[PDB]
RNA sequence: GUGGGAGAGGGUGGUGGAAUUCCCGGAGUAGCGGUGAAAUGCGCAGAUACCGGGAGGAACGCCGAUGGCGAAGGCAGCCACCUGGUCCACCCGUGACGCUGAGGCGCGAAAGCGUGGGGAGCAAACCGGAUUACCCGGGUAGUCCACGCCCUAAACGAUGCGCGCUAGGUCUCUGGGUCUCCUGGGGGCCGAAGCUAACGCGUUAAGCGCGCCGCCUGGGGAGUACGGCCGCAAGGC
RNA sequence: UUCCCGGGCCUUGUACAAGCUGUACCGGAAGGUGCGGCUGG
């Protein structure tokens, strides 16, 4: 599916709303492409900026470990 | 001796070698083995079979120190990754978690000439 | 011989060749070999040069390092009698003995060679190093290198080879070989140069070691102030900076001069200057 | 063979015993198109075996053959300008072929004067689990499993 | 002029994490590294693999794109300040105030130079190992910063700038509206008429026209010679 | 059918009576390497 579809209404510029932002990160703490998030470019740009900001604030992980083979 | 009975395993998988290091929860290594320790030299060290024997040998030693179960962490993307995981899985230790921990730069130091040309 | 080359290669089941005739005579014309002068050839190959050389040579010594090419030297040089093959590497040999032995009856020798360039320069350097009593050398040696051998003291050619040879011998470009004469086009031009030895060194023999050391030091960072070159490359020299500044004054060489723009005379003066003053 | 699968020739079953393995063995013995000589040699060896051993020669021969069947072979393979002895599993066809050829070679290498004697001795020894044939089989197997490092060249 | 919009446009400060190297502490022992296969090298003064702390330099993974911005060169972590260009809507103000431009003046990748710092990784020259180059292990300049030079290129869309006219279809970035659609500005593919020696171009023209600038006149010799200007020099015009 | 030899087909660079380039070096230059750029592969 898509991350946007698997979500209600929310703000993209909210750099503290961790519960929604975590939905846009893969198993590893990496930003998902538009292929997965299902956003327009402007939306993707704003989301990536916010993600980086939250990363700095320590709320979101820069990197992590995938628990598989 | 240590009789920790529960530790973890670090599998450094390279293109040239595979090294398995068994360790306590605290991270202090207890025993280790590689492709070279078995007796292989040169390119033979890189083979998946070498990785299998390395994993089995390290596991046997760790059992001799009285372990029962580990938590395997794999680093690198060499040719002995899956073979080492499989070997350690059925060696008798009760592996609980398999974790990928490949350390990659965030576009840091400039790589060697052979590894450059990357877009 | 272009027509005969194919025949000879095919007749044995068989690499750059001077197939053409006129110029092989011209190179020895410049080489000036007679019944009075013998020849040491190190790159005889198939013997293309050797035939026309021995047509007017006093004595012919040839060095072949590979015995795969050996079986064909005799039968291709059947009529000629002057030929004597020493299946020895010239670098690993002792040319002094061979000079004393084969050409004892003969009068003079002038080396004429045609060998791959990756082997050329070390051989010439060795033949110069050991002070052999031979008249001269004639080699075609990748023109871009020959210019560096001659190398008037500027224009991107005056390096360190230039100083060595001009300290040992005289050099001047003799002939340009037009491309494509070789059956495989070598994508590069070659030049026949001649070296003529001299009686003793060009300049002071005060310290060969220190002279060459200074030569190497001044040309490490070619694009650089000579003073910077010396303070960098010359051993320590950081704490001896003031000494260098001192010595450069009385030698009448300016600090900011880009050592690539020096003469052998100036280099000799500086070699004498720094030695016995630096330590 | 680039196109087909090269179907195996069906050998006529033996007349004395009525099995194909004996026919194959006789063929493996026969040289210069002398088949009568090979048959006589084989039957003389069978008589010797029967005379000096409790059970029928046919069982001895069959189980000796089964005893000299290798499973792992090394094949020469070119990878990166290097020659590697890759381990492979051998099909029953190749198994039987190698078994019979090795048995014959080992029999012919014995110091006994008469061909029948040599054949009988080799068959009896391979039945027991020793001799030239079994030894060569074991060496072939041990040449594999000693270079399992290259097995990933599936080949 | 008013209202709004997008952006790795530029400069100055300041901090975030990943990774490599090195130092210290712990635990543990015989290889590690590298190749097509090996060697040089490192290691019993304890190397590799592991955990914890510290030092420093350089570059910013995912998003990231056939994307965006700039006159070109070129420009990617994030925050703030200062600042340039540009698009759209309203159609409010001036009333031809315009286009181009020999000289001049400024900017100008990389590689180089001078005066001082800095130096983790990589790495010309150089030093060794295998096998002619290639490949492997080390390694100075250099790569980084400040100031001052240098002024070159496959500096390219090999296409000077401005304006007007000449079928469309499709993808995409970004504004506006009366939002199935319509109307602006960028970036790409396929194609009417037409053009071209051909390849191909084709509303982002290499079509049809007007204005201004630059440049060409057979190849080699030759971007060489001499002269002049500039540069510390290499060299540039 | 991986390799040896030969023949044919599809796609691709030179001659038929992967390179290139600015700059900087090169005492194993038939040319090589370092830092960038281009496709005229």
PDB file of N, CA, C and O (backbone and C1' of nucleotides) in Angstrom, chain F residues 3-35:
ATOM      1  P     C F   3      33.499 -19.656 -23.077  1.00  0.00           P
ATOM      2  O5'   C F   3      34.971 -20.259 -22.965  1.00  0.00           O
ATOM      3  C5'   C F   3      35.971 -19.634 -22.139  1.00  0.00           C
ATOM      4  C4'   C F   3      37.132 -20.573 -21.920  1.00  0.00           C
ATOM      5  C3'   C F   3      37.813 -21.074 -23.183  1.00  0.00           C
ATOM      6  O3'   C F   3      38.720 -20.129 -23.734  1.00  0.00           O
ATOM      7  C1'   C F   3      37.426 -22.896 -21.732  1.00  0.00           C
ATOM      8  P     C F   4      38.812 -19.958 -25.324  1.00  0.00           P
ATOM      9  O5'   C F   4      39.516 -21.310 -25.789  1.00  0.00           O
ATOM     10  C5'   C F   4      40.860 -21.626 -25.378  1.00  0.00           C
ATOM     11  C4'   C F   4      41.469 -22.641 -26.312  1.00  0.00           C
ATOM     12  C3'   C F   4      41.145 -22.449 -27.786  1.00  0.00           C
ATOM     13  O3'   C F   4      42.013 -21.504 -28.396  1.00  0.00           O
ATOM     14  C1'   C F   4      40.730 -24.695 -27.190  1.00  0.00           C
ATOM     15  P     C F   5      41.423 -20.428 -29.426  1.00  0.00           P
ATOM     16  O5'   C F   5      41.165 -21.294 -30.739  1.00  0.00           O
ATOM     17  C5'   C F   5      42.269 -21.895 -31.444  1.00  0.00           C
ATOM     18  C4'   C F   5      41.775 -22.753 -32.583  1.00  0.00           C
ATOM     19  C3'   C F   5      40.833 -22.080 -33.569  1.00  0.00           C
ATOM     20  O3'   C F   5      41.513 -21.296 -34.541  1.00  0.00           O
ATOM     21  C1'   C F   5      39.968 -24.198 -32.976  1.00  0.00           C
ATOM     22  P     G F   6      40.794 -20.008 -35.166  1.00  0.00           P
ATOM     23  O5'   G F   6      39.595 -20.620 -36.063  1.00  0.00           O
ATOM     24  C5'   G F   6      39.934 -21.376 -37.252  1.00  0.00           C
ATOM     25  C4'   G F   6      38.692 -22.010 -37.828  1.00  0.00           C
ATOM     26  C3'   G F   6      37.533 -21.071 -38.175  1.00  0.00           C
ATOM     27  O3'   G F   6      37.722 -20.382 -39.402  1.00  0.00           O
ATOM     28  C1'   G F   6      36.712 -23.009 -37.087  1.00  0.00           C
ATOM     29  P     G F   7      36.978 -18.987 -39.646  1.00  0.00           P
ATOM     30  O5'   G F   7      35.440 -19.401 -39.905  1.00  0.00           O
ATOM     31  C5'   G F   7      35.111 -20.140 -41.106  1.00  0.00           C
ATOM     32  C4'   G F   7      33.664 -20.565 -41.068  1.00  0.00           C
ATOM     33  C3'   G F   7      32.619 -19.463 -40.864  1.00  0.00           C
ATOM     34  O3'   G F   7      32.352 -18.722 -42.046  1.00  0.00           O
ATOM     35  C1'   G F   7      32.098 -21.322 -39.501  1.00  0.00           C
ATOM     36  P     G F   8      31.839 -17.209 -41.935  1.00  0.00           P
ATOM     37  O5'   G F   8      30.325 -17.343 -41.392  1.00  0.00           O
ATOM     38  C5'   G F   8      29.326 -17.935 -42.258  1.00  0.00           C
ATOM     39  C4'   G F   8      28.000 -18.022 -41.543  1.00  0.00           C
ATOM     40  C3'   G F   8      27.440 -16.729 -40.941  1.00  0.00           C
ATOM     41  O3'   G F   8      26.855 -15.862 -41.903  1.00  0.00           O
ATOM     42  C1'   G F   8      27.205 -18.485 -39.389  1.00  0.00           C
ATOM     43  P     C F   9      26.753 -14.287 -41.603  1.00  0.00           P
ATOM     44  O5'   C F   9      25.646 -14.206 -40.461  1.00  0.00           O
ATOM     45  C5'   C F   9      24.276 -14.554 -40.739  1.00  0.00           C
ATOM     46  C4'   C F   9      23.437 -14.469 -39.489  1.00  0.00           C
ATOM     47  C3'   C F   9      23.362 -13.100 -38.829  1.00  0.00           C
ATOM     48  O3'   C F   9      22.466 -12.201 -39.470  1.00  0.00           O
ATOM     49  C1'   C F   9      23.753 -14.739 -37.176  1.00  0.00           C
ATOM     50  P     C F  10      22.760 -10.620 -39.446  1.00  0.00           P
ATOM     51  O5'   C F  10      22.494 -10.226 -37.924  1.00  0.00           O
ATOM     52  C5'   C F  10      21.149 -10.111 -37.428  1.00  0.00           C
ATOM     53  C4'   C F  10      21.140  -9.611 -36.005  1.00  0.00           C
ATOM     54  C3'   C F  10      21.877  -8.307 -35.740  1.00  0.00           C
ATOM     55  O3'   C F  10      21.160  -7.126 -36.078  1.00  0.00           O
ATOM     56  C1'   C F  10      22.498  -9.889 -34.108  1.00  0.00           C
ATOM     57  P     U F  11      21.962  -5.804 -36.520  1.00  0.00           P
ATOM     58  O5'   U F  11      22.696  -5.349 -35.180  1.00  0.00           O
ATOM     59  C5'   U F  11      21.959  -4.787 -34.074  1.00  0.00           C
ATOM     60  C4'   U F  11      22.839  -4.663 -32.852  1.00  0.00           C
ATOM     61  C3'   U F  11      23.997  -3.679 -32.958  1.00  0.00           C
ATOM     62  O3'   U F  11      23.616  -2.339 -32.663  1.00  0.00           O
ATOM     63  C1'   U F  11      24.788  -5.735 -32.092  1.00  0.00           C
ATOM     64  P     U F  12      24.528  -1.111 -33.159  1.00  0.00           P
ATOM     65  O5'   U F  12      25.760  -1.139 -32.148  1.00  0.00           O
ATOM     66  C5'   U F  12      26.896  -0.275 -32.347  1.00  0.00           C
ATOM     67  C4'   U F  12      28.146  -0.874 -31.744  1.00  0.00           C
ATOM     68  C3'   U F  12      29.446  -0.404 -32.379  1.00  0.00           C
ATOM     69  O3'   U F  12      29.910   0.817 -31.814  1.00  0.00           O
ATOM     70  C1'   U F  12      29.463  -2.768 -32.219  1.00  0.00           C
ATOM     71  P     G F  13      30.598   1.929 -32.745  1.00  0.00           P
ATOM     72  O5'   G F  13      32.018   2.215 -32.027  1.00  0.00           O
ATOM     73  C5'   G F  13      32.944   3.142 -32.656  1.00  0.00           C
ATOM     74  C4'   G F  13      34.354   2.601 -32.597  1.00  0.00           C
ATOM     75  C3'   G F  13      35.162   2.693 -33.897  1.00  0.00           C
ATOM     76  O3'   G F  13      35.833   3.942 -34.015  1.00  0.00           O
ATOM     77  C1'   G F  13      35.290   0.483 -33.035  1.00  0.00           C
ATOM     78  P     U F  14      36.523   4.376 -35.405  1.00  0.00           P
ATOM     79  O5'   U F  14      38.025   3.870 -35.238  1.00  0.00           O
ATOM     80  C5'   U F  14      39.042   4.231 -36.194  1.00  0.00           C
ATOM     81  C4'   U F  14      39.882   3.030 -36.570  1.00  0.00           C
ATOM     82  C3'   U F  14      40.147   2.864 -38.060  1.00  0.00           C
ATOM     83  O3'   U F  14      41.317   3.583 -38.455  1.00  0.00           O
ATOM     84  C1'   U F  14      39.414   0.796 -37.135  1.00  0.00           C
ATOM     85  P     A F  15      41.464   4.157 -39.953  1.00  0.00           P
ATOM     86  O5'   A F  15      41.601   2.839 -40.842  1.00  0.00           O
ATOM     87  C5'   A F  15      42.774   1.999 -40.762  1.00  0.00           C
ATOM     88  C4'   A F  15      42.753   0.909 -41.816  1.00  0.00           C
ATOM     89  C3'   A F  15      42.759   1.369 -43.277  1.00  0.00           C
ATOM     90  O3'   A F  15      43.597   0.506 -44.048  1.00  0.00           O
ATOM     91  C1'   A F  15      40.946  -0.076 -42.926  1.00  0.00           C
ATOM     92  P     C F  16      43.848   0.771 -45.618  1.00  0.00           P
ATOM     93  O5'   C F  16      42.812  -0.215 -46.322  1.00  0.00           O
ATOM     94  C5'   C F  16      42.366   0.029 -47.673  1.00  0.00           C
ATOM     95  C4'   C F  16      41.500  -1.105 -48.172  1.00  0.00           C
ATOM     96  C3'   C F  16      41.045  -0.988 -49.625  1.00  0.00           C
ATOM     97  O3'   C F  16      41.164  -2.234 -50.309  1.00  0.00           O
ATOM     98  C1'   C F  16      39.168  -1.281 -48.228  1.00  0.00           C
ATOM     99  P     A F  17      42.554  -2.664 -50.994  1.00  0.00           P
ATOM    100  O5'   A F  17      42.990  -1.359 -51.801  1.00  0.00           O
ATOM    101  C5'   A F  17      44.249  -0.704 -51.549  1.00  0.00           C
ATOM    102  C4'   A F  17      44.675   0.099 -52.754  1.00  0.00           C
ATOM    103  C3'   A F  17      43.614   1.027 -53.342  1.00  0.00           C
ATOM    104  O3'   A F  17      43.661   2.299 -52.706  1.00  0.00           O
ATOM    105  C1'   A F  17      44.516  -0.333 -55.058  1.00  0.00           C
ATOM    106  P     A F  18      36.820  -1.360 -21.600  1.00  0.00           P
ATOM    107  O5'   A F  18      37.117  -0.972 -23.117  1.00  0.00           O
ATOM    108  C5'   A F  18      38.343  -0.309 -23.484  1.00  0.00           C
ATOM    109  C4'   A F  18      38.127   0.579 -24.688  1.00  0.00           C
ATOM    110  C3'   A F  18      39.084   1.762 -24.801  1.00  0.00           C
ATOM    111  O3'   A F  18      40.280   1.406 -25.486  1.00  0.00           O
ATOM    112  C1'   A F  18      36.858   2.530 -25.035  1.00  0.00           C
ATOM    113  P     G F  19      41.631   2.230 -25.228  1.00  0.00           P
ATOM    114  O5'   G F  19      41.136   3.766 -25.095  1.00  0.00           O
ATOM    115  C5'   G F  19      41.859   4.805 -25.791  1.00  0.00           C
ATOM    116  C4'   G F  19      40.911   5.678 -26.578  1.00  0.00           C
ATOM    117  C3'   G F  19      41.192   7.180 -26.501  1.00  0.00           C
ATOM    118  O3'   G F  19      42.214   7.564 -27.410  1.00  0.00           O
ATOM    119  C1'   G F  19      38.890   6.800 -26.115  1.00  0.00           C
ATOM    120  P     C F  20      43.446   8.439 -26.891  1.00  0.00           P
ATOM    121  O5'   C F  20      42.861   9.921 -26.906  1.00  0.00           O
ATOM    122  C5'   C F  20      42.196  10.429 -28.076  1.00  0.00           C
ATOM    123  C4'   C F  20      41.274  11.569 -27.718  1.00  0.00           C
ATOM    124  C3'   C F  20      41.887  12.708 -26.922  1.00  0.00           C
ATOM    125  O3'   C F  20      42.643  13.585 -27.749  1.00  0.00           O
ATOM    126  C1'   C F  20      39.762  12.170 -26.031  1.00  0.00           C
ATOM    127  P     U F  21      43.963  14.295 -27.173  1.00  0.00           P
ATOM    128  O5'   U F  21      43.380  15.375 -26.155  1.00  0.00           O
ATOM    129  C5'   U F  21      42.532  16.441 -26.622  1.00  0.00           C
ATOM    130  C4'   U F  21      41.851  17.135 -25.467  1.00  0.00           C
ATOM    131  C3'   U F  21      42.765  17.760 -24.428  1.00  0.00           C
ATOM    132  O3'   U F  21      43.285  19.011 -24.854  1.00  0.00           O
ATOM    133  C1'   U F  21      41.006  16.612 -23.343  1.00  0.00           C
ATOM    134  P     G F  22      44.762  19.441 -24.418  1.00  0.00           P
ATOM    135  O5'   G F  22      44.540  20.244 -23.036  1.00  0.00           O
ATOM    136  C5'   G F  22      43.889  21.537 -23.078  1.00  0.00           C
ATOM    137  C4'   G F  22      43.748  22.086 -21.679  1.00  0.00           C
ATOM    138  C3'   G F  22      44.997  22.040 -20.793  1.00  0.00           C
ATOM    139  O3'   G F  22      45.849  23.150 -21.048  1.00  0.00           O
ATOM    140  C1'   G F  22      43.132  21.200 -19.589  1.00  0.00           C
ATOM    141  P     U F  23      47.442  22.996 -20.921  1.00  0.00           P
ATOM    142  O5'   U F  23      47.655  22.697 -19.370  1.00  0.00           O
ATOM    143  C5'   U F  23      47.374  23.700 -18.376  1.00  0.00           C
ATOM    144  C4'   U F  23      47.407  23.092 -16.996  1.00  0.00           C
ATOM    145  C3'   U F  23      48.714  22.418 -16.610  1.00  0.00           C
ATOM    146  O3'   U F  23      49.663  23.371 -16.148  1.00  0.00           O
ATOM    147  C1'   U F  23      46.903  20.996 -16.061  1.00  0.00           C
ATOM    148  P     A F  24      51.229  23.149 -16.422  1.00  0.00           P
ATOM    149  O5'   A F  24      51.618  21.997 -15.393  1.00  0.00           O
ATOM    150  C5'   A F  24      51.350  22.143 -13.986  1.00  0.00           C
ATOM    151  C4'   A F  24      51.740  20.891 -13.241  1.00  0.00           C
ATOM    152  C3'   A F  24      52.939  20.129 -13.790  1.00  0.00           C
ATOM    153  O3'   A F  24      54.159  20.751 -13.419  1.00  0.00           O
ATOM    154  C1'   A F  24      51.223  18.605 -13.232  1.00  0.00           C
ATOM    155  P     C F  25      55.538  20.249 -14.052  1.00  0.00           P
ATOM    156  O5'   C F  25      56.031  19.158 -13.004  1.00  0.00           O
ATOM    157  C5'   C F  25      56.846  18.066 -13.447  1.00  0.00           C
ATOM    158  C4'   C F  25      56.527  16.811 -12.678  1.00  0.00           C
ATOM    159  C3'   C F  25      57.218  15.567 -13.203  1.00  0.00           C
ATOM    160  O3'   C F  25      58.545  15.486 -12.703  1.00  0.00           O
ATOM    161  C1'   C F  25      54.920  15.107 -12.948  1.00  0.00           C
ATOM    162  P     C F  26      59.775  15.437 -13.725  1.00  0.00           P
ATOM    163  O5'   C F  26      59.852  13.892 -14.104  1.00  0.00           O
ATOM    164  C5'   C F  26      59.911  12.899 -13.066  1.00  0.00           C
ATOM    165  C4'   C F  26      59.369  11.580 -13.554  1.00  0.00           C
ATOM    166  C3'   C F  26      60.045  10.981 -14.776  1.00  0.00           C
ATOM    167  O3'   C F  26      61.268  10.340 -14.442  1.00  0.00           O
ATOM    168  C1'   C F  26      57.695  10.766 -14.974  1.00  0.00           C
ATOM    169  P     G F  27      62.654  10.935 -14.977  1.00  0.00           P
ATOM    170  O5'   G F  27      63.699   9.720 -14.793  1.00  0.00           O
ATOM    171  C5'   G F  27      63.489   8.489 -15.532  1.00  0.00           C
ATOM    172  C4'   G F  27      64.626   7.531 -15.256  1.00  0.00           C
ATOM    173  C3'   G F  27      64.509   6.663 -13.995  1.00  0.00           C
ATOM    174  O3'   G F  27      65.068   5.381 -14.250  1.00  0.00           O
ATOM    175  C1'   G F  27      66.486   7.920 -13.886  1.00  0.00           C
ATOM    176  P     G F  28      64.427   4.077 -13.595  1.00  0.00           P
ATOM    177  O5'   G F  28      64.328   3.053 -14.834  1.00  0.00           O
ATOM    178  C5'   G F  28      63.493   1.881 -14.711  1.00  0.00           C
ATOM    179  C4'   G F  28      62.679   1.728 -15.973  1.00  0.00           C
ATOM    180  C3'   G F  28      61.295   2.388 -15.975  1.00  0.00           C
ATOM    181  O3'   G F  28      61.005   2.935 -17.254  1.00  0.00           O
ATOM    182  C1'   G F  28      61.062   0.047 -16.279  1.00  0.00           C
ATOM    183  P     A F  29      60.610   4.482 -17.407  1.00  0.00           P
ATOM    184  O5'   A F  29      59.359   4.435 -18.394  1.00  0.00           O
ATOM    185  C5'   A F  29      59.505   4.002 -19.761  1.00  0.00           C
ATOM    186  C4'   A F  29      58.233   4.262 -20.540  1.00  0.00           C
ATOM    187  C3'   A F  29      58.323   4.036 -22.052  1.00  0.00           C
ATOM    188  O3'   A F  29      57.094   3.491 -22.530  1.00  0.00           O
ATOM    189  C1'   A F  29      57.638   6.244 -21.639  1.00  0.00           C
ATOM    190  P     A F  30      57.075   2.158 -23.429  1.00  0.00           P
ATOM    191  O5'   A F  30      56.938   2.712 -24.919  1.00  0.00           O
ATOM    192  C5'   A F  30      55.872   3.613 -25.281  1.00  0.00           C
ATOM    193  C4'   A F  30      55.395   3.357 -26.696  1.00  0.00           C
ATOM    194  C3'   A F  30      54.456   2.165 -26.887  1.00  0.00           C
ATOM    195  O3'   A F  30      53.504   2.440 -27.911  1.00  0.00           O
ATOM    196  C1'   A F  30      56.398   1.854 -28.193  1.00  0.00           C
ATOM    197  P     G F  31      52.007   2.835 -27.529  1.00  0.00           P
ATOM    198  O5'   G F  31      52.132   4.390 -27.094  1.00  0.00           O
ATOM    199  C5'   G F  31      51.323   4.903 -26.007  1.00  0.00           C
ATOM    200  C4'   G F  31      52.040   4.653 -24.704  1.00  0.00           C
ATOM    201  C3'   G F  31      51.318   5.080 -23.425  1.00  0.00           C
ATOM    202  O3'   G F  31      50.329   4.145 -23.020  1.00  0.00           O
ATOM    203  C1'   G F  31      53.586   5.747 -23.333  1.00  0.00           C
ATOM    204  P     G F  32      49.097   4.633 -22.124  1.00  0.00           P
ATOM    205  O5'   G F  32      49.720   4.768 -20.643  1.00  0.00           O
ATOM    206  C5'   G F  32      50.287   3.591 -20.019  1.00  0.00           C
ATOM    207  C4'   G F  32      50.868   3.943 -18.671  1.00  0.00           C
ATOM    208  C3'   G F  32      49.948   4.707 -17.715  1.00  0.00           C
ATOM    209  O3'   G F  32      49.021   3.853 -17.059  1.00  0.00           O
ATOM    210  C1'   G F  32      52.080   5.725 -17.738  1.00  0.00           C
ATOM    211  P     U F  33      47.568   4.406 -16.671  1.00  0.00           P
ATOM    212  O5'   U F  33      47.862   5.339 -15.413  1.00  0.00           O
ATOM    213  C5'   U F  33      48.486   4.797 -14.234  1.00  0.00           C
ATOM    214  C4'   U F  33      49.019   5.895 -13.345  1.00  0.00           C
ATOM    215  C3'   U F  33      48.010   6.921 -12.865  1.00  0.00           C
ATOM    216  O3'   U F  33      47.157   6.447 -11.835  1.00  0.00           O
ATOM    217  C1'   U F  33      49.967   8.037 -13.548  1.00  0.00           C
ATOM    218  P     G F  34      45.682   7.049 -11.713  1.00  0.00           P
ATOM    219  O5'   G F  34      45.904   8.491 -11.027  1.00  0.00           O
ATOM    220  C5'   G F  34      46.575   8.546  -9.744  1.00  0.00           C
ATOM    221  C4'   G F  34      46.716   9.979  -9.300  1.00  0.00           C
ATOM    222  C3'   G F  34      45.463  10.851  -9.415  1.00  0.00           C
ATOM    223  O3'   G F  34      44.578  10.617  -8.329  1.00  0.00           O
ATOM    224  C1'   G F  34      47.345  12.030 -10.234  1.00  0.00           C
ATOM    225  P     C F  35      43.002  10.598  -8.583  1.00  0.00           P
ATOM    226  O5'   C F  35      42.641  12.146  -8.689  1.00  0.00           O
ATOM    227  C5'   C F  35      43.069  13.079  -7.677  1.00  0.00           C
ATOM    228  C4'   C F  35      42.767  14.496  -8.099  1.00  0.00           C
ATOM    229  C3'   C F  35      41.398  14.716  -8.719  1.00  0.00           C
ATOM    230  O3'   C F  35      40.390  14.839  -7.722  1.00  0.00           O
ATOM    231  C1'   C F  35      43.046  15.793 -10.037  1.00  0.00           C
TER     232        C F  35
END
